[model samples]
Target chain A: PQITLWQRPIVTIKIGGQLKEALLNTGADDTVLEEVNLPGRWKPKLIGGIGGFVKVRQYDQVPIEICGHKVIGTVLVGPTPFNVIGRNLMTQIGCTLNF
Target chain B: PQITLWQRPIVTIKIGGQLKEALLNTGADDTVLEEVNLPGRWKPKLIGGIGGFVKVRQYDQVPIEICGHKVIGTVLVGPTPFNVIGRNLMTQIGCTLNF
Candidate 1:
């Protein structure tokens, strides 16, 4: 399927059976989710963005479903204004930019 | 034309006869460039992003060439980590997201 980039590409995603909205952020390197309850052992790490860096909990091999496509990989939970799906997971879903 | 979102969609853009690499940032609302000497009158405005808000010089109707497609719109100049080509400008070139 193709999604037109009329604005910020916001999409519904399911993480750990919970549905959430995330921005398709090509400028970001990793997927970042607002702090959520999850059952796993995570490591504390720092990530940087356009503004600055923030501490986040990194959980590996997390299952996420974007537009019904199942993808399992690293998921970071932190104090983010919005959920962001970065290049890491974007590649798994076969996302592309068209003009 | 289609561009795969394999990574941060960095493309060459020309502004005022200078070439620069910019990221196609869907997460941002407006285009932002690093502080550069441009012959134009601008207004002061604040923009917020993943990090926080910062004051920037907003130049109206600035001519820019992205991948050979000419685009003229608001261009903000400030201390940005990278040149960001936001949706405001992306729409001018008929860009889209594909999955």
Candidate 2:
């Protein structure tokens, strides 16, 4: 799949059997989603961004679908202005930044 | 050129005759740089991000080189965690998100 760059590269992602729109953030190191219900237990972690540090629930092996590709990886649920698809999952889907 | 997605897609950018490393941020609307000297006058504007809104000097037609390609566009100077190459400039460089 090829996507042209937009002010915000928004995309639909499926997580926990629910679909939601998220921003593709190459600047982010990990996937950060708005707070969501996780079926399993997770460890608490802190992440920092343009704003400040945020407490997040880090769930391992979370299955998510992006652009119809199913991927299982670490997902952090927290208070974020945007649900961010970071490079962690971007790599699995073979994302490339190209001209 | 095709570049694989990294945790943070940091790249070298040339601006104002100086080279600096910046993050490629699809989530951002405009290119933002840390405080730097500009050759011309700029309009003051406000931009918001994960943190909050901040005042910036918006310089138009600023020439920048990214990945060996020269791009001239609006460049905002302000306080930021990292120098960001946003979609505004990314589009001019013919950037594509691909798998």
Candidate 3:
């Protein structure tokens, strides 16, 4: 059997004012967090999908740390796998992508 | 040969006041957006990982859409996969868990 090299660690964070675990996916072009387990207080927005831009909202001035680097950028909330760790978050940890 | 069945689609949205293409993953739990790609105006916050809860911020009363459904809720801002379509956003669209 063939095995996949794409193995990401599991980490939990408070989204929408609650704490939860998000699976990290590096193969993805963007990062995603789970909204299903989030607190009731966390409200989600509609963002456009292939069907069209649905309802997508933005959060201004969010502080985050990846590997060890620190940054403040906008985050989008909705529904997702668990947690996705993409380029932005990976680059901070000195990861390079090869196509 | 082995193939991954977790293929999703892509869509563009104006997150933090800018439009960009994000991948849609059904395996995701919560909807996440790329804070690194967002406009300069939108700031990001730090959410804890293994280091423990650091900085996580929420946006209250934001409007968003998925597949086709539209709803208003709070979104978490941080670095993530790309875009997630988790339960909170899925339950609204008629998704069921097999577990």
Candidate 4:
């Protein structure tokens, strides 16, 4: 699928028996989401954005469905204003930037 | 051209006779650059990000060459750690998110 830039490239994601919206962020390295509940063990990690950095909980081997594609990767739970699907999961789903 | 997530989707941009590297950020709404000399009348605007909002200088109809495509659009000058080519310029160059 080819998504244009006329609007935010947001898509529905199914994770932890929950459906949520996230943006496909090519500029982001790790997938970060707002507060959410998940079942797993995590470690404290720090991720940076435009303004500064924030500490987040990193959960590995989490199963998530992005636009119908099911994948397992690391998800960071943090204090981001918006949820972003970054390169970590983008690669798993074979996402790319094209023109 | 198709860009994979194996590496940062960084591209070269030509602006104001200066060449700079920028990331193709689909998650970003407006194009924001670090301190650079741009000629034009601009208004002080506040843009939000993951952490907080920052006041930036917005220059309209600014000429920029992204990759090999030329476009004129609004550009923001601020304290962003890295330069981003957001949807504003991505639309001009017909960039899209593909799989």
TM-score of each: 0.90, 0.93, 0.34, 0.91
lDDT of 2 by residue, B1-99 (tens): 888886578889999889899988887788999967878789999887334568999999999999998989899998988899999999989998998
Those runs of model 3 whose alpha carbons end farther than 4 Å from true positions after fitting are: A1-99, B1-6, B9-18, B23-29, B36-48, B97-99
lDDT of 1 by residue, B7-62 (tens): 56899999989999999988888899995668868899988743466899999989
- Sort the candidates on TM-score, descending order: 2, 4, 1, 3
Global CA lDDT computed for model 2: 0.87
The candidate that achieves the highest DockQ relative to the unseen native structure: 4
Better candidate by DockQ, 2 or 4? 4
Report the lDDT tens digits of candidate 2 across residue range A29-59: 7899996787888999989833456789999
lDDT of each: 0.85, 0.87, 0.43, 0.90
Displacement of residue A77 (Cα, Å) in model 3 is 31
Scanning candidate 3 chain A in windows of ten residues, the lowest lDDT window is A1-10
- lDDT order, best first, reads 4, 2, 1, 3
Model 4 iRMS (Å) reads 0.8
lDDT of 3 at B42: 38
The recovered share of true contacts, given per candidate in order, is 0.86, 0.94, 0.00, 0.89
The best candidate by lDDT is 4
Writing each residue's lDDT as its tens digit, candidate 1 over A5-98 gives 6667899999977899999988888899995677869999988743466789999988899999998878999887789998888888888778
Model 1 misplacement above 4 A: A49-52, B49-52
How does model 2 score on DockQ? 0.81
